[PDB]
């Protein structure tokens, strides 16, 4: 008879790691909401929050969720043992992630262009810390995909590489989820 | 797997057998709610204690009542859920005649 | 149950040579590329005790300065930096690393695995923790010295306005590098227990120590990244022009809430594993199984669950927190600790206690932590905390709890597992000398500080007047503090001598009655920890292995008024 | 992995209940010696702590409904059940020390805030991480 | 508590070093502390006894000499006793929490009807006291005295915004000081003089704390109470007002800072001098009538020590203090 | 049909699967060189060539 189905150890490891990172973002959320609670007394929040550009935010949100969809198509390709489908979909995900990074970068450049920076207000500090840490996470995720591509280019595609691709997909999905939370907090619940 | 086998005169440690209660989610969730229930006891004690020195005069009845309500719902929930989680163990004890 | 046929001319495997026989260069490159959990755990332990001595020297300098009124040899700035760095290194570079070192060595042996789940991640955790330690200590090379704002780093005092100088920054990074090192250690311990357990070792046949490590792993993963986020926020406020921790934004109480939400689970993270170590030591030397096993597990999980709601009892004098709620919760967290105490004295009840060194250390820990927690309950009530908060009473309380739970019990663990970690046994006489020196010096140092705390001396005071009225008590504290400093000389000499010329260990369990699974294997274990796995069938694999004739008793006398279930009929067929 | 998947449900429900209790409490109780009003620090922490434990518990349960009756969880398993390959484990690697040093360089860089130290630290860090992840798959020397 | 401690040497031992206290709620806190210590001693001895029993009674050599054999009874579970021993601490901490709530609530309640309210400012590193309002009984004018300085406080309110415009923190300037109360009758603490606040006996008194700089704390050990002083206390959601029902006996009492504020945290002492109620009217009329006069001159006008007798200022030289005479001679 | 790397182990999906995000046939991590292999192997099958060499005296 065939062997037992045992838990995927690397999947448990990465899931535990993402559950840990959720509490990393808890701190930034708490700082932002304390800032908002203070600001709503003076109404200054209602002024600074009018500097933002919500349709551009929606566009980059659409780009990032598209990245998630492409990533999971790559995962299906991986579990089938098809290396070339994995390469295809992961390169597309890399492209979309880079476009999201450029989206946030252009957002920042325009914002400092028309009078919002870290020194301008408490809103500036809260907005930029909360979005910039997530931007660093997105950059790290794109780097992780490129490292996966290095791996499956150099090594033969065994289950050890398939689970690596599966594991990086978890991290990217966590990145998409925390972006959705951040967007709903900053552009909608504001 | 799929069934145990013990000879007469052999007593194992009972935990994590398929009939065990520790292996099921209702029991642990009941433990959580049972721990939660004591918060209501604390709340009602806070209400009456603040009353004892003439404070919280405008809301102490509401705090006492809501504390008791939360305590009773949480503790009855925990007890019922724990008993539900232990039902397989009772059925097993009926079946076999061995407690461990 | 199967019984195998005999093997022709069987011989037991060659058990490994003891330590001290290593050749030249046999550990340098092995250390640099290590991914063995057990060698890595040993070096964890050694590095943590190095930081222990380093921090305690600063502590002795503090005491020497407070021996008499007037600033004899320190300034105000140097005194401030001293207590800040003493607190930081002793909590973050000694305590948490020693916890993870003992976890890394012992847990795979207890759960019957060859190696940890993620070896290279474990090595990364070790090295990044040491990197954070050196970064934290680099502040002293600054002309202006290291950080000076207490180990809590309250704001606005930590603002760029109110704390210039790069030492204040180096603290932030040294702590952060330490924090992720801790997290990298925790990722393993969960995944290991979830995925590499031995055959027949169900979850409720694990030793209590690894249960505590499991709960501590989840707790630490909750709370270390929150510290990292808060610390990066403070550095963001400092280097850039950030305003999040500005007082006009409410930054002071924001920082206090966030930091103490991190910080109280840190003390429980230090607390639970050493409770587990004594929960392993006490059954062995009383020759009695652990009393109320699953009850202790529920108590440990209750401590883990309650640690997350207790956090704001460190702020009763801030005038911001809600007093009744947090006072009630920090009363509730006393219950399972008392359950653990009751279980310890219960398993000692009518036992056959032999008083080898680790048992001495364990009973000393119990005696110290009893009064420490008894003091902590007094600190838990707000109306007493209005006077007690941030005084020397607080100092004595948390030194009782930390010095009991960490120092006494870590020494107990070192003496307990020195055979399994080295293949040699420590000197008994030096151990007793070390214990009595530490015990009398400790109680002399810290019992009298309750009185100066009550009389009105605040914490963190660098100088005080002759007319204040608490100079004699400080003098009595200082002499016994120097005795505490002298106490570690026999410990260092004993470890050094026993490592290289100690008594060799022949049997697998020199203490005789080891219950846990690590006492069934060799001393030291082989590279992959197990030349053969016993038939695991209870919470005492090694005991039931070495004493088969006891098993019929061990299963029968377990429960008061035990049922007739031994006479029940046969239940199945093979 | 049955018992540990399900024992996580106690801490998470307790934390969630404490979060809701605390939010109502601080938003309503106008006690002297304190100021009325919801505090977001602490409440956010409690809800996302419940989130962490719930993520762990739900993933473990979602996985455990797939796996078989593993011998480590079988209360009367024999040592012969687990005979075979346990898995692959790294024998040795210099890269954990290297990337610890890289993180140290980056941390020192943000201490003094010399921008070149930050850039070189990040570059060195991703280099060391890549060398870690490609260790057991570097191609054989091409003649 | 309403019930007094045992008293005698037992009370002194149970005290165990607390000041007696000089307010009603100080007495309440002391009584609660004494009885809590009684219960704590009961627990401490009744478990140290069991550990001593293990040391002397449950030894292995005794049982082996007695012939008990190589092993004990091997008992593991006694579930009813375990549940009883679990229920006991539950009830203990519960009944303790009841009295905790009682004493805490009678301490913290802000309904004591002050006759005097003093605004207090903490700064790095000294104290500045200012009489904010005084009831007509003690005030010079017969009607209630109000001490807020119009011009100096107008400057504080004007500091909120527009120094030609930075306004980063929620629309206000980062250097806002509108939360500080500036009064016309003020005592200013210096490194050359320990400040002394003068208060009457047997009047409900109020303290309104704030901090120019990093967080401080106001601690009077004879009140058996301390409270943190923060910058922008409203922004921190910190309660900046606390009231004492009265002070019950005259005298000079040291008060300290109990929060790590910086380099000179140890040097930040003050004194609280409680004087006869009839003399307080003379003091306030003297300070009001000729404001140029110093605090010491007013204390001389009362007929008591011009300077803080409880604590003298620290020597401010970093080398002279080596021989332990770190005390400045005020006169 | 989809491509499959020949290093992929063979299996029958109708009665199981090879690896998923949740479960695998191993307790630890999978072999980088293929779980289907059976180490050790012969000296010449290794591809290694041990050098004899001497140095001047
Ligand atoms: C950073 C290091 C980078 C690499 C540097 C390097 O290559 O150094 C090589 C050089 C020696 O290399 P080697 O010749 O291969 O060493 C093998 C020995 O010759 C022969 O082997 P060995 O068994 O002697 O191993 C060395 C060492 C054993 O190895 C280590 O100590 C390694 C420590 C690594 C972590 C760093 C600590 C600082 O043992 C001893 O030196 C004797 C006993 C030492 C203990 C006494 C001091 C205790 C202080 C703390 C208090 C006790 C706490 C409880 C401990 C309980 C343990 C069961 O220096 C070191 O290894 C220093 C470390
Ligand atoms: C954003 C910041 C974090 C960036 C890293 C994100 C980590 C999670 C990514 C997803 C994941 O789990 O990938 C594993 C996945 C599977 O590797 P595998 O070798 O098949 O895993 C099984 C091992 O053989 C099992 O054997 P092993 O135990 O020998 O190998 C363990 C191995 C793989 O471990 C795992 O797969 C499970 C554990 C996940 C990592 C947990 C530790 C994370 C770092 C410390 C805690 C967080 C601090 C923040 O551990 C690592 O790769 C360690 C990564 C160290 C990251 C250091 C970040 C320093 C920040 C300084 C501030 O990784 C890959 O194959 C792709 C590359 C991974 C990410 C590259 C990152 C790019 C550079 C960004 C640096 C920042 C600029
Ligand atoms: C902590 C403080 C000490 C520094 C951190 C530990 C040592 C890091 C470098 C280790 C390099 C290495 O593999 O040496 C193997 C080499 C022994 O040869 P092996 O282990 O048989 O080589 C196996 C692989 O071929 C080895 O892999 P490979 O053939 O691909 O060679 C990789 C090697 C050489 O680099 C390359 O292959 C690429 C060239 C650019 C490298 C740097 C780019 C940036 O990469 C590096 O040297 C990277 C340096 C990373 C420095 C991190 C920051 C500190 O180690 C030594 O001879 C001594 C290592 C240095 C002393 C370490 C202890 C100091 C105390
Ligand atoms: C200024 C202009 C200077 C122009 C003159 C110099 C031109 C050098 C061109 C590069 C070269 O010679 O490459 C081959 C040369 C040696 O290759 P090899 O020995 O023939 O092949 C075996 C591998 O080195 C064995 O190592 P591996 O490849 O397995 O793992 C290391 C990994 C390291 O890869 C990375 O660090 C990149 C990871 C992905 C990041 C994705 C986001 C990037 C934005 O890959 C490489 O080092 C090769 C790619 C280098 C460019 C990456 C950017 O590569 C290196 O020595 C690179 C090591 C240091 C890389 C630092 C980045
Ligand atoms: C390993 C390190 C530590 C442990 C363990 C520890 C245990 C406790 N602590 Fe703590 N502590 C506080 C309360 C407790 C309580 C309730 C416990 C518990 O673990 C105590 C339970 C332990 C026992 C051993 C219980 C007794 C045993 C038995 C068997 C009887 C059951 C109990 C009954 C029956 C109730 C007692 C009955 C009576 C009648 C009183 C509070 C506030 O409630 C503060 C902040 C105060 C302030 O204002 O800053 C504090 C401050 C600190 C700090 C401050 C550091 C800083 O400020 O920079 C540190 C490092 C620290 C460490 C540690 N602490 N603690
Ligand atoms: C795990 C946690 C802790 C341990 C253990 C600990 C041990 C001591 N403590 Fe402490 N500490 C104080 C006194 C002592 C003394 C005398 C010892 C003793 O254990 C120290 C003796 C032990 C030693 C171990 C040192 C002996 C060193 C020798 C004999 C030789 C050195 C030379 C070499 C070459 C070493 C060998 C090196 C090799 C590599 C082999 C005092 C007051 O007397 C304060 C409050 C002061 C104030 O005003 O704020 C204080 C403050 C703190 C704080 C609060 C810091 C803050 O508020 O910011 C914390 C958290 C803390 C934790 C801990 N502390 N301590
Ligand atoms: C790390 C360094 C992050 C960038 C720091 C910086 O320059 O921030 C300001 C930048 C330009 O804006 P501005 O502040 O107007 O110009 C400089 C005035 N001295 O513009 C910005 O602040 C853009 C957004 C930066 C987001 C923060 C990046 C992560 C920081 C983690 C700590
Ligand atoms: C393609 C690549 C870019 C790297 C940084 C450049 C320097 C820089 O930024 O300076 C401005 C920068 C100023 O800061 P910034 O303008 O804020 O970035 O310099 C520094 O901060 C660093 C000062 C470094 C002092 C070095 C002292 C001498 C070291 C000698 C080392 C000799 C090694 C010999 C080895 C022999 C064997 C090989
Ligand atoms: Cu202060
Ligand atoms: Cu202070
Ligand atoms: Ca001195
Ligand atoms: Cu705490
Ligand atoms: Mn305070």
Residue numbers in the entry:
A (entry chain F): 16 to 205
B (entry chain J): 13 to 112
C (entry chain D): 2 to 575
D (entry chain G): 1 to 143
E (entry chain E): 29 to 359
F (entry chain K): 17 to 73
Quote the study that presented this structure, word for word:
Here, we report the high-resolution cryo-EM structure of the cyt bcc-aa3 supercomplex from Corynebacterium glutamicum, the prototype for such a complex. The dimeric cyt bcc complex is located in the centre and on both sides, a monomeric cyt aa3 oxidase is attached.
In a second structure of the as-isolated supercomplex obtained at an average resolution of 3.1 Å, a co-purified menaquinone molecule was identified close but not fully slid into this catalytic position. The orientation of the ring plane is similar to that of bound stigmatellin but the oxygen atoms are 3.6 Å more distant to the H-bond partners as compared to the respective oxygen atoms of stigmatellin. This menaquinone position likely reflects a product state leaving the active site. Indeed, extraction and spectroscopic quantification of menaquinone from the purified supercomplex revealed a ratio of 4.2:1 for menaquinone per supercomplex monomer, in line with the three resolved menaquinone molecules in the native supercomplex and additional fragmentary map features in the quinone exchange cavity. At the Qi site, the site of menaquinone reduction of cyt bcc complex close to the inner (electronegative) side of the membrane, a co-purified native substrate (MKQi) was resolved in a cavity formed by QcrB helices A, E and D. It is located in 4.6 Å distance to haem bH well suited for rapid electron transfer. The position is stabilised by multiple non-polar interactions and a single H-bond between the side chain of Glu38QcrB and one carbonyl-moiety of MKQi. Moreover, we identified a previously unknown menaquinone binding site, which we call Qc site referring to its central position. The ring of the bound co-purified MKQc is located opposite of the Qo site and in 12.6 Å distance to haem bL. The Qc site is thus well suited to function for transient storage of surplus electrons, keeping haem bL oxidised to aid electron bifurcation and support rapid reduction of semiquinone at the Qi site, in order to limit ROS producing bypass reactions.
